[PDB]
Structures are given as structure tokens and as C-alpha cells.
Write an enzyme that holds these catalytic residues in place. Structure first.
Site, mmCIF file in Angstrom:
data_model
loop_
_atom_site.group_PDB
_atom_site.id
_atom_site.type_symbol
_atom_site.label_atom_id
_atom_site.label_comp_id
_atom_site.label_asym_id
_atom_site.label_seq_id
_atom_site.Cartn_x
_atom_site.Cartn_y
_atom_site.Cartn_z
ATOM 1 N N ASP A 1 8.288 -2.275 9.157
ATOM 2 C CA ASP A 1 7.212 -2.686 8.220
ATOM 3 C C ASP A 1 7.765 -2.792 6.789
ATOM 4 O O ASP A 1 7.406 -3.737 6.068
ATOM 5 C CB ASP A 1 6.019 -1.731 8.300
ATOM 6 N N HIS B 1 0.858 -10.149 3.705
ATOM 7 C CA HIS B 1 0.596 -9.717 5.114
ATOM 8 C C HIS B 1 0.323 -10.952 6.008
ATOM 9 O O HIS B 1 -0.750 -11.050 6.636
ATOM 10 C CB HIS B 1 -0.512 -8.669 5.164
ATOM 11 N N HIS C 1 1.304 -6.866 14.495
ATOM 12 C CA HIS C 1 0.854 -5.604 13.841
ATOM 13 C C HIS C 1 -0.075 -5.867 12.633
ATOM 14 O O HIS C 1 -0.776 -4.926 12.245
ATOM 15 C CB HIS C 1 2.063 -4.733 13.443
ATOM 16 N N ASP C 2 -0.064 -7.060 12.014
ATOM 17 C CA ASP C 2 -0.931 -7.386 10.840
ATOM 18 C C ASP C 2 -1.849 -8.574 11.165
ATOM 19 O O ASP C 2 -2.281 -9.274 10.227
ATOM 20 C CB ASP C 2 -0.092 -7.621 9.576
ATOM 21 N N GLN D 1 8.118 0.471 -8.172
ATOM 22 C CA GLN D 1 9.050 0.248 -7.036
ATOM 23 C C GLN D 1 9.956 1.467 -6.876
ATOM 24 O O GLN D 1 10.072 1.986 -5.759
ATOM 25 C CB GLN D 1 9.856 -1.026 -7.232
ATOM 26 N N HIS E 1 5.863 -12.349 7.328
ATOM 27 C CA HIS E 1 5.999 -10.877 7.317
ATOM 28 C C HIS E 1 6.079 -10.346 8.752
ATOM 29 O O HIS E 1 6.874 -9.406 8.988
ATOM 30 C CB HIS E 1 4.850 -10.253 6.511
HETATM 31 C C1 LIG Z 1 8.027 -3.325 1.249
HETATM 32 C C2 LIG Z 1 6.886 -2.652 0.555
HETATM 33 C C3 LIG Z 1 5.802 -2.115 1.286
HETATM 34 C C4 LIG Z 1 4.774 -1.520 0.634
HETATM 35 C C5 LIG Z 1 3.589 -0.901 1.282
HETATM 36 N N1 LIG Z 1 4.850 -1.484 -0.758
HETATM 37 C C6 LIG Z 1 4.009 -0.977 -1.722
HETATM 38 C C7 LIG Z 1 4.578 -1.252 -2.930
HETATM 39 C C8 LIG Z 1 4.071 -0.893 -4.282
HETATM 40 S S1 LIG Z 1 5.088 0.463 -4.929
HETATM 41 C C9 LIG Z 1 4.189 0.862 -6.357
HETATM 42 N N2 LIG Z 1 4.044 0.122 -7.439
HETATM 43 C C10 LIG Z 1 3.268 0.910 -8.298
HETATM 44 C C11 LIG Z 1 2.866 0.410 -9.611
HETATM 45 C C12 LIG Z 1 2.120 1.215 -10.472
HETATM 46 C C13 LIG Z 1 1.751 0.737 -11.716
HETATM 47 C C14 LIG Z 1 2.112 -0.548 -12.113
HETATM 48 C C15 LIG Z 1 2.836 -1.355 -11.259
HETATM 49 C C16 LIG Z 1 3.209 -0.880 -10.011
HETATM 50 C C17 LIG Z 1 3.010 2.117 -7.735
HETATM 51 N N3 LIG Z 1 3.591 2.078 -6.484
HETATM 52 C C18 LIG Z 1 3.567 3.156 -5.495
HETATM 53 N N4 LIG Z 1 5.786 -1.915 -2.747
HETATM 54 C C19 LIG Z 1 5.939 -2.055 -1.431
HETATM 55 N N5 LIG Z 1 6.950 -2.623 -0.766
HETATM 56 MG MG LIG Z 2 -0.334 -3.464 7.971
HETATM 57 ZN ZN LIG Z 3 3.016 -5.022 8.045
#
Ligand SMILES: Cc1cc(C)n2cc(CSc3nc(-c4ccccc4)cn3C)nc2n1
Ligand SMILES: [Mg+2]
Ligand SMILES: [Zn+2]
Length: 315
Positions: free
Chosen positions: A220, A71, A109-110, A272, A75
Site C-alpha cells: 500500500d 486511490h 483493495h481500493d 512526509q 495505485h
Molecule cells: C504513500 C503514502 C501513503 C499515505 C497514507 N500517506 C499519507 C501521507 C501524508 S504524511 C503527512 N503530511 C502531513 C502534513 C501536515 C501538515 C501540512 C502538510 C502535511 C502530516 N502527515 C502525517 N503521505 C502518504 N504517503
Molecule cells: Mg485504502
Molecule cells: Zn491503497
């Protein structure tokens, strides 16, 4: 820093590539402030911000981003570029005051992100969670934007009427607030409803505010719309930030959610995949419905989803 940026010119090879959704700013760090000026002048014209105020404002925004893994300043410009490409492709749908306001909002925004989530600040009764009950960091981000606007020679809006000043501050406030991912899920569901029933109307100001909210989300999240190697490498930065927070929770006897537990980093590919299926795909789908020239964002996100499916079965 300010003076040098007033006399910056964007190389002609980037002049063609900056217009594309998939464009990665990653390799041109020294050019990011000047890329933002370029995007403002192309979107809003050379004429409307005083160049001295804009460059002073831009360099103070950069200084008020922290050296966190995700962040950060990189970004901010990545999200502003995506908004630029959205605005360019849908230019006449939005007003001069919306283009001014939405590019500054994406850049800001961040502002002053500490690498901590709203949950963290709320669960651990951090002061900001006392100041701001909901959308904790996003309210701070808007507070930081107003503060920089009010520094000597930073008020880029000082040529507007008082009416237009309060209009662009509300465009900015709503747009920064709508990057609260907690708000996106409700917003997108309503816009998907309004799209299917045919009730969606851009001249309806609450509808207009929701479409802008979705754009802010679409911007975002846009690292999931870059070429696969860029997406894979940005995820590193995201988990580094989430894992640093999980570590703070462990020091205080709290087990973090898996996404923030560096012991569960095996499960990243499936993490992901779930985020694409539940968050990103629906986002760019609804956006492509409302604003069809934004379809390449959905195409690139789809390409990165099949890439994760590939990774999950050892490929
Ligand atoms: C561009 C972007 C923006 C945001 C907010 N992001 C959030 C994530 C994480 S997605 C995710 N990984 C895991 C997980 C669970 C157990 C082990 C490893 C990972 C669970 N979730 C839901 N990526 C993101 N990219
Ligand atoms: Mg933010
Ligand atoms: Zn952001």
C-alpha cells in the site's frame, strides 16, 4: 478491451525490470492490465485462471476504480506489482492459494474509493459508516470485489473446490481489511514483539495472517520506495485527495487536520518526514526482519527520508 488484453505480450525490456522492487509502472499506462496478467502467470502459472475470465475480471476492476487523484487504477497496479516482487523473492513461504488471493486483493483493495477517509464517512454519518462500523471503506472494497467475482464470466475462482473458494475469499477479506492504516500500528507492534521474542512462526495461522497484513501495508505504501522524483510526484496526488476532503470539511464549518488543509501546504516536507519516521520506516524495518529479501524496500525508503531531510533545509 477484454479481447485485446488476451493477445497482449509484455516487451522484453520490462521482463527484466518488472522483477525489481523499485520498478515504476507510471510510464506504461496502456500496459497495466497486461502487466497484471504477466505478474499472475509468472507467480501462479499460465494454467490456473481461465484467461478469458481473468481479462474480463481485470477490465471490470479498472472500470470500478474512480478518477480520483491517488486511490485510483494506477495505485491498484502499483500495489499489485509490489506484492508480486515480494512473492517472487519469498515464493515458497506462501501457498498457491495465497499468491492467487494476495495479487487479486492488492488489485482490488481500493475498489470504488471516493477520495474520502473513514473519519470523514464516520464524523459525517455517511451510509457506508452505518453499513460498516469500523474499517469502513476497506469493507466496501471487499464487498465490491465479491460483486465483480459474481458478474457473468468473472468468477476466476470457479475451478476451485468450495473449501478453497471460501479459503481464498478469507485470504482476500483479511488482506483488504489490513490496508486500514488504523489497524497497521497494532499489527506491526505485535509482529515486532513476536520477531524479538523468537515466538514468530509462519505455520501459526494467526501469525501468518499478521505477516500478510504487514505485506499489504508494505505494498500500500510502496510509492515511498520508488526513485525520489516518482515519490515527490505521487505525494502531489495524495495531498490533492486529502486537500479536496479538507475543503469539504471547511464548507461544513469544520477545520480539517493540517494534513488535509491546503492552507498548510508549506508544512508538506515535515509532514512526509513524520510519516516516514512514524509509519513507513518501521513498516519496511519489521518486514525486512520477517522477510529479509524485502530489504531493498527499506533501502529506497531510507534514501527518500534523507531526501526529505535535505528538502527541509532548503536543498
Ligand atoms: C504513500 C503514502 C501513503 C499515505 C497514507 N500517506 C499519507 C501521507 C501524508 S504524511 C503527512 N503530511 C502531513 C502534513 C501536515 C501538515 C501540512 C502538510 C502535511 C502530516 N502527515 C502525517 N503521505 C502518504 N504517503
Ligand atoms: Mg485504502
Ligand atoms: Zn491503497
Amino acid at each position: 478491451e477484454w479481447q485485446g488484453l488476451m493477445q497482449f505480450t509484455l516487451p522484453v525490456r520490462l521482463c527484466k525490470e518488472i522483477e525489481l522492487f523499485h520498478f515504476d509502472i507510471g510510464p506504461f499506462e496502456n500496459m497495466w492490465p497486461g502487466i497484471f496478467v504477466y505478474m499472475v502467470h509468472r507467480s501462479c502459472g499460465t494454467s490456473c485462471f481461465e484467461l478469458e475470465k481473468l481479462c474480463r475480471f481485470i477490465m471490470s476492476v479498472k472500470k470500478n476504480y474512480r478518477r480520483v487523484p491517488y486511490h485510483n487504477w494506477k495505485h491498484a497496479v502499483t500495489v499489485a506489482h509490489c506484492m508480486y516482487a515480494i512473492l517472487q523473492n519469498n515464493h515458497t513461504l506462501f501457498t498457491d492459494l495465497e499468491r492467487k488471493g494476495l495479487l487479486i486483493a492488492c488489485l482490488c483493495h481500493d475498489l470504488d474509493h471516493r477520495g474520502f477517509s473513514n473519519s470523514y464517512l464516520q464524523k459525517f454519518d455517511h451510509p457506508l459508516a452505518a453499513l460498516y462500523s469500523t474499517s469502513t471503506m476497506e469493507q466496501h472494497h471487499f464487498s465490491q470485489t465479491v460483486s465483480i467475482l459474481q458478474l457473468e464470466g468473472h468468477n476466476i475462482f470457479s475451478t476451485l473446490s468450495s473449501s478453497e473458494y471460501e479459503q481464498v475469499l478469507e485470504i482476500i477479506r483479511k488482506a483488504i481489511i489490513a490496508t486500514d492504516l488504523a489497524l497497521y500500528f497494532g499489527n506491526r507492534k505485535q509482529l515486532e514483539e513476536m520477531y524479538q521474542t523468537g515466538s514468530l512462526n509462519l505455520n501459526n495461522q494467526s501469525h501468518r495472517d499478521r505477516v500478510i497484513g504487514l505485506m499489504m501495508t508494505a505494498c500500500d505504501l510502496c510509492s515511498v520506495t520508488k526513485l525520489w522524483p516518482v515519490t515527490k510526484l505521487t505525494a502531489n496526488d495524495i495531498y490533492a485527495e486529502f486537500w479536496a476532503e479538507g475543503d469539504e470539511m471547511k464548507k461544513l464549518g469544520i477545520q480539517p487536520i493540517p494534513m488535509m488543509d491546503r492552507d498548510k501546504k508549506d508544512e508538506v516536507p515535515q509532514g512526509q518526514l513524520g510519516f516516514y519516521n512514524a509509519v513507513a520506516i518501521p513498516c519496511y524495518t519489521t518486514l525486512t526482519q520477517i522477510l529479509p529479501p524485502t530489504e531493498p524496500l527499506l533501502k529506497a525508503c531510507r534514501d527518500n527520508l534523507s531526501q526529505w531531510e535535505k528538502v527541509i533545509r532548503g536543498e
